[PDB]
Amino acid sequence: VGSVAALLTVVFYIAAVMATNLYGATFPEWFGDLSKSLYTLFQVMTLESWSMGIVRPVMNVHPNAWVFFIPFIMLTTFTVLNLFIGIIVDAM
Amino acid sequence: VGSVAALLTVVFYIAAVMATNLYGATFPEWFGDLSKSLYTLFQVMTLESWSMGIVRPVMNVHPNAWVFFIPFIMLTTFTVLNLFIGIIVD
Amino acid sequence: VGSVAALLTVVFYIAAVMATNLYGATFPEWFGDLSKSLYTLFQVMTLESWSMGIVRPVMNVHPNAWVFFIPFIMLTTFTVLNLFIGIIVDAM
Amino acid sequence: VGSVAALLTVVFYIAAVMATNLYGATFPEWFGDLSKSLYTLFQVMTLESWSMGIVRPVMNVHPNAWVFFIPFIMLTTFTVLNLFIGIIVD
Ligand code: NA
Ligand code: NA
Ligand code: NA
Ligand code: NA
């Protein structure tokens, strides 16, 4: 439960560092600094406008942006699901 | 199960009171009164257009709005998940 | 499991009948006929653009539209969750 | 768990082949090639803008497009839920 939250924080920070470098110059409102990137990757994790709002516009400059975002989604969404179930199971 | 629904209603009302005060003047369509706020925070909880539709436009006036909305999402979505599982288990 | 799918079909049809009558005249693209309504209520159940795309525009003509849509969401989303878990539990 | 991931990959590929043929000519940005189709069907599976962004605009050319997309959603979202629970249980 604690290790799951620790793995998610580390992965979320590493990805936000990676995103700032990759799309920061071309998409500064979404990835211009670490803070902007952490906020965008939280939104992407909630699946809110991830494709129409973020990744499709990013792919028009970086055609392989999906190699970062789709595995990011698949990982964080599974980890969050594993985390929330983990708290509920430990409570019972 | 009942206490979970009670905790969620209290938290949802407190947050709706907080939102009306914070962004009611600058965003009156989404937070102009308690009723408008309760409706918006229900939408934010369902994750529908929370960032592109609500929080990014709010952050252009209030840059720290994320300190209210991200913890609100993390709390209510976990509580709802705990509530729905609670009914199914019982 | 079967009764859950039966309850969901009945509720989904009743709601689609209710919506066609309520918002069909003022929002004919989303609720103009039973077929259009069933499609919109399926979208509303998946939570896709339910508020920005459907219910906020509907509330500008019908201010109490939320009395129909919010309880519809709370019911169908809980029933679907109960249905999907029901199949998985019965399979094991 | 492995067979669930195998069933999902096969179904996802078959559907992406089907979509390219069906709406590739009329919607080339979303279904112009197998790669574009696989990306769109992943988005549709996450429920992101599936109706307002994809299926409503597709239905204005192909009125029965819902016969492909609604069953696609019902299948893949159930399979993914079955997959994620499968890993956690194991
Ligand atoms: Na959305
Ligand atoms: Na969504
Ligand atoms: Na969702
Ligand atoms: Na959206």
Residue numbers in the entry:
A (entry chain A), C (entry chain A): 131 to 222
B (entry chain B), D (entry chain B): 131 to 220
Can you quote the paper on this entry?
The crystallographic identification of these sites as arising from sodium ions is discussed in detail in the Appendix (including Appendix Figs S2, S3, S4, S5 and S6).
Prokaryotic sodium channels are homotetramers, in which each monomer contains six transmembrane segments and is homologous to a single eukaryotic pseudorepeat. The selectivity filter (SF), which determines the channel's Na+ permeability over other cations, is formed by the close association of the P loops from each of the polypeptide chains.
